[PDB]
Amino acid sequence: ELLFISPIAKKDIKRPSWRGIPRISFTRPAVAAKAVETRANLKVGTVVIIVGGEHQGKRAVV
């Protein structure tokens, strides 16, 4: 987790933190979408045009 992230107590000088903000360690101890919905306005028994694959220009009822 992003817990165990802690600020370093060093003040080394190689790296300097300008404001109150201090350098962050970002370390942990060593031990260790989408709905794809049915489309509205297609009810039980709507008349429909088929435009793909095997049937083209052929109407069908759901």
Partner: protein, 48 residues
Amino acid sequence: RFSLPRSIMTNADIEAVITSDAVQSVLNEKKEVVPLPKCLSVGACEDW
């Protein structure tokens, strides 16, 4: 003129020295790096 050359270490290898409990008691714990998420953080935005 010659006299017989000394070594810098007393031992052959290091690994006996580090693994001893004289050293190990003083050490801090072994850290390891977290990988960071890529993503709603805040608990209630819908008050706004």
